[PDB]
Design a protein around this ligand. Sequence first.
Ligand code: BCL
Ligand code: BCL
Ligand SMILES: CC[C@H]1c2cc3[nH]c4c(c3C)C(=O)[C@H](C(=O)OC)c4c3nc(cc4[nH]c(cc(n2)[C@@H]1C)c(C(C)=O)c4C)[C@@H](C)[C@@H]3CCC(=O)OC/C=C(\C)CCC[C@H](C)CCC[C@H](C)CCCC(C)C
Ligand SMILES: COC1=C(OC)C(=O)C(C/C=C(\C)CC/C=C(\C)CC/C=C(\C)CC/C=C(\C)CC/C=C(\C)CC/C=C(\C)CCC=C(C)C)=C(C)C1=O
Ligand SMILES: COC(C)(C)C(=O)C/C=C(\C)CC/C=C(\C)CC/C=C(\C)CCCC/C(C)=C/CC[C@H](C)CC/C=C(\C)CCC=C(C)C
Ligand SMILES: CCCCCCCC/C=C\CCCCCCCC(=O)OC[C@H](O)CO
Ligand SMILES: CCCCCCCCCCCC[N+](C)(C)[O-]
Ligand SMILES: CCCCCCCCCCCC[N+](C)(C)[O-]
Ligand SMILES: CCCCCCCCCCCC[N+](C)(C)[O-]
Ligand SMILES: CCCCCCCCCCCC[N+](C)(C)[O-]
Ligand SMILES: CCCCCCCCCCCC[N+](C)(C)[O-]
Ligand SMILES: CCCCCCCCCCCC[N+](C)(C)[O-]
Ligand SMILES: CCCCCCCCCCCC[N+](C)(C)[O-]
Ligand SMILES: [Cl-]
Ligand SMILES: [Fe+3]
Lengths: 300, 281, 240
Amino acid sequence: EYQNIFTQVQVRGPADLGMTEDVNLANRSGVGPFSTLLGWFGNAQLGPIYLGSLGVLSLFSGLMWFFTIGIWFWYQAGWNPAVFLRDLFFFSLEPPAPEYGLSFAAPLKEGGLWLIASFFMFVAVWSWWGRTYLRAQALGMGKHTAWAFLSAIWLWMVLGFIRPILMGSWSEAVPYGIFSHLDWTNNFSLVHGNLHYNPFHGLSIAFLYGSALLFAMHGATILAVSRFGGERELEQIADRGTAAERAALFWRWTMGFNATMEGIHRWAIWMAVLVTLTGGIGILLSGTVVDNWYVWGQNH
Amino acid sequence: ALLSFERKYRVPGGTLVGGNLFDFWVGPFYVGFFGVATFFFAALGIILIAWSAVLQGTWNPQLISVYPPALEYGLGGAPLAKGGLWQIITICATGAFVSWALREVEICRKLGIGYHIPFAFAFAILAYLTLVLFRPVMMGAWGYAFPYGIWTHLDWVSNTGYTYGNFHYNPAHMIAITFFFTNALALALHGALVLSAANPEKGKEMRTPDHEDTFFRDLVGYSIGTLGIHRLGLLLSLSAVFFSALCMIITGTIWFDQWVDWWQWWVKLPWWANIPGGING
Amino acid sequence: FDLASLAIYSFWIFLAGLIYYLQTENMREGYPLENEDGTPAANQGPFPLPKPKTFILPHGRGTLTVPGPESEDRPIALARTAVSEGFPHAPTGDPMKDGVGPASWVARRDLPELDGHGHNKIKPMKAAAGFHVSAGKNPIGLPVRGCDLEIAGKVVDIWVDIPEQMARFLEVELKDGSTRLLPMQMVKVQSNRVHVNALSSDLFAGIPTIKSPTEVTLLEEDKICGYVAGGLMYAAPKRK
Ligand code: BCL
Ligand code: BCL
Ligand SMILES: CC[C@H]1c2cc3[nH]c4c(c3C)C(=O)[C@H](C(=O)OC)c4c3nc(cc4[nH]c(cc(n2)[C@@H]1C)c(C(C)=O)c4C)[C@@H](C)[C@@H]3CCC(=O)OC/C=C(\C)CCC[C@H](C)CCC[C@H](C)CCCC(C)C
Ligand SMILES: COC1=C(OC)C(=O)C(C/C=C(\C)CC/C=C(\C)CC/C=C(\C)CC/C=C(\C)CC/C=C(\C)CC/C=C(\C)CCC=C(C)C)=C(C)C1=O
Ligand SMILES: COC(C)(C)C(=O)C/C=C(\C)CC/C=C(\C)CC/C=C(\C)CCCC/C(C)=C/CC[C@H](C)CC/C=C(\C)CCC=C(C)C
Ligand SMILES: CCCCCCCC/C=C\CCCCCCCC(=O)OC[C@H](O)CO
Ligand SMILES: CCCCCCCCCCCC[N+](C)(C)[O-]
Ligand SMILES: CCCCCCCCCCCC[N+](C)(C)[O-]
Ligand SMILES: CCCCCCCCCCCC[N+](C)(C)[O-]
Ligand SMILES: CCCCCCCCCCCC[N+](C)(C)[O-]
Ligand SMILES: CCCCCCCCCCCC[N+](C)(C)[O-]
Ligand SMILES: CCCCCCCCCCCC[N+](C)(C)[O-]
Ligand SMILES: CCCCCCCCCCCC[N+](C)(C)[O-]
Ligand SMILES: [Cl-]
Ligand SMILES: [Fe+3]
């Protein structure tokens, strides 16, 4: 039995330059090379990519963030390349100390540099959000991508900007470091009385686990009916075929109910966005409204 | 009751055991032999949970907790109230999970579809057995397994992790987390992309899959394709669970210290190990 | 009644409505439920039927409104085996030919799927300028072998999904000179042969034919794919 996990025979033709619609073709690059490697698992074509003002701004702004953290790591490493690679995961760019509160007057080496990096990351992420909206608009598509992205932006905004402000101190934000931001995560829970007892944190976990549950279900389902062309989901929505019927009947016979080819993608988008939507709430309430989740939990 | 298109698919055949004896439906549910087995194990385990609740002295679901035997029992049997119920419930649970999967296989055969779904479910089963069977046995006591309680089983996660410092530093744990986050990232994008194509701007006709490709090439310069994203989602979710079982089967069996110590082979390479300066100098 | 208590209560209310909405949305196909005789079922569940939505299909292909009056639009060669509900319906004739069970097909539109530019999405490679095999084993020329280990034909062309650059069917020439399409997902391309486990060599001729040698319609795709998948159950008698 062939399982359809990897392509058996790759085929290649003239590159696909894509749909035009109202896309400004001046800002599309040329086509890149084909990747036989990727062709075993998906499409082998690379590019073209669209690159307008927002993309350039996001890209440049994102590299300034990267470079800002970088020079700080080279400074912590005493400019020694050997020390740099040894302690790469231990370096950390920390926010201003509590003393500075919400002031931008922290000297560079005491959180001033963290504030600059956060500015570039802020500009890079939001300009990239505007990018996901206008790319869909230019093709006449719905804005479901930009809205799902807001859910992730929400948690990032709460962690590093909204909550620190409500707490009145930048020191409450997360540091830039591999190991350092893990330690921050562990201390955040210990300080707030065990996040296991933050109900929004438990909800967030149910949706994280549930996203892996649902994508395994959905991926496996579409591959099991790919012998009926089930992956061509848009035309299955406009003209139900035996692929969509067998898929629905498998799950109805298994657990008693089922989705449609379109409806399953609404289950999916909500399962995923609810992860960061509930999580952002749980963090925003920690330290502002609830000091100890375990103790709070025993009264409710 | 049936879906408008369901009847033509309700034919006989496809069973693995019992021929046509259990080849029927109750409402929407297909039974089959393993539908009966599932019901038997599930009904038995739920009785033993209710029985544990009586021994425990509460009927609040938030307080019921069936604990495994104490470590001193090792891998032997324990009395019902002193871990025996946990032992029998673990057998019933395993029976139900495996029966569920073989039922799914019988439903794949009657519908002439692939076996990918029960295959993917078996990874979740493997992870359950990693925590209640493989790791306790390799460690030499059922007590190392987790308790069956809504909140007590979270305490077990916290107690087990902090036994090894910050469990974040478990390197397999990092990988598993990365797949969990990437999976939810990919599920959100996929759901959004289909919906954005089927429900375009007002005053627009339904989009085509070519638009889906174009949207992602415009965004990040590559589109994996309509088949590849379902391959990818299946892979991200199973890999996440695979490395989850892996990150635990090695904890307490071949690794016993704090997981942050594992990262010292990098820091203490005898050449740069002593160079002054940095965080470790 | 602190602010955190009201957030979590508010959320559970929001979630109950979200589930209600998601479930109704997933009822735009196959509902209302029917009895096994086709009539409407009395118990329809607690969730109501969603209000119709309309898709405007591209390429002047009309519009779809769901939910709407459902029809199989084809005869179903099955018969009840029990007076009570919940029992299998037994084929009355040849289920592979009658298209029932795992051999089922849906009466989709007898038109080919189109790409974004209005062209046929699927094309034989001999009609697709520039397309070729770039990696793996090229099956053209290879003999096709059935589950009875007999040869049924040889591969003569590949039908490719052009927008996705993907092989979707193998065009197989039969002993009598005609050709059939085989789903790419139901064949095993080997070094010296293509092995099809789903069908026996003498069941390839039964695969439904296409009416145009350079295009395949959604209806034809469903009939072909259903027939081949149905061989796993109904061609098993002579499976070596
Ligand atoms: C996976 C690694 C850890 C673990 C760590 C955590 C952490 C950390 C958290 C949970 C949370 C939960 N876990 Mg736990 N949990 C584990 C093993 C399990 C097993 C099991 C048989 O292996 C089960 C059934 C559960 C069940 C549960 C739920 C009570 C809850 C939400 C899960 C969810 O929606 O997932 C995704 C699945 C779905 C969305 C599908 C629907 C699943 C439903 C919700 C399952 C209900 C089961 C029911 C309560 C128990 C059985 C009932 C029988 C009739 C007796 N855990 C192991 C030991 N689990 C969260 C919580 O809030 O706990 C209070 C939480 O924060
Ligand atoms: C203080 C706690 C420690 C910690 C200690 C641990 C420990 C200890 C463990 C994990 C494990 C996990 N941790 Mg950790 N972890 C922490 C912080 C985190 C953070 C974070 C952001 O900080 C994250 C993202 C994670 C992420 C994760 C995952 C990789 C993993 C849980 C998923 C899993 O294995 O599922 C596997 C899936 C299952 C077990 C589900 C099986 C379901 C079965 C087959 C079917 C059930 C059916 C049901 C009963 C039927 C109900 C029917 C009704 C109709 C509803 N951890 C901190 C540092 N973590 C666990 C792990 O890897 O386990 C292998 C684990 O044991
Ligand atoms: C492998 C990748 C992910 C995944 C995939 C996955 N799960 C699956 C499938 C797949 C592909 C199915 O096909 C199957 C299904 O039918 O889903 C609807 C299933 C399934 N995944 C489920 C749950 C589940 N999956 C999880 C996780 C995952 N599933 C992974 C993240 C989780 C968690 C915690 O993350 C849970 C809770 C079920 C909804 C369903 C299997 C239902 C089943 O087996 O039914 C028969 C058994 C019963 C009806 C109950 C038996 C009762 C027992 C006798 C007693 C219970 C004892 C138990 C130990 C209690 C412990 C409780 C405490 C821990 C709180
Ligand atoms: C693309 O095509 C697809 C579809 O069609 C088009 C789908 O339809 C689905 C199914 C998915 C959904 C409907 C989404 C909702 C599911 C979620 C959120 C997962 C979480 C699910 C649940 C919480 C439900 C779990 C339910 C149960 C375990 C059922 C309860 C069990 C019972 C009643 C017992 C089972 C019965 C028996 C064993 C037989 C009876 C025995 C006797 C002895 C009589 C997928 C994946 C898909 O890709
Ligand atoms: C050779 O190497 C060179 C030097 C070239 C390099 O480039 C090496 C570079 C690296 C190795 C980079 C390493 C990168 C990391 C370790 C990054 C790790 C990042 C994280 C763990 C993410 C944590 C992010 C969480 C926070 C705190 C985000 C802040 C977001 C806020 C919403 C922004 C807040 C804004 C503020 C305070 C002010 C700015 C302006 C406004 C309008 C708000
Ligand atoms: C070769 C890599 C080039 C650079 C990559 C940038 C980084 C992408 C990272 C994570 C997102 C994962 C991508 C998968 C999301 C696809 C969503 C989807 O549904 O795609 C189907 C298909 O593309 C519609 O035709
Ligand atoms: C904050 C996260 C919100 C969840 C996103 C859910 C997507 C549904 C929104 C539909 C958008 C449709 N529209 C009109 C923009 O084309
Ligand atoms: C979109 C699907 C929604 C599924 C909802 C699953 C609910 C899981 C229950 C988690 C309970 C967490 N809590 C609040 C008790 O801490
Ligand atoms: C708390 C999670 C419980 C959800 C489980 C769903 C049970 C089966 C769904 C209904 C199918 C049976 N029904 C109603 C058609 O007779
Ligand atoms: C663990 C694999 C599943 C097979 C085990 C079967 C044990 C349960 C017996 C149930 C069958 C009872 N009966 C009378 C219907 O045959
Ligand atoms: C029916 C499937 C059996 C698979 C094994 C189940 C694992 C549970 C182990 C419990 C140990 C209890 N006992 C009595 C053997 O010591
Ligand atoms: C650890 C062994 C127990 C796992 C459960 C086995 C039953 C799952 C269904 C079989 C999956 C194999 N396949 C591909 C033929 O369906
Ligand atoms: C993750 C939570 C899932 C809850 C889903 C509840 C919806 C069940 C729908 C049952 C009704 C189906 N029916 C009988 C009308 O076909
Ligand atoms: Cl741009
Ligand atoms: Fe899909």
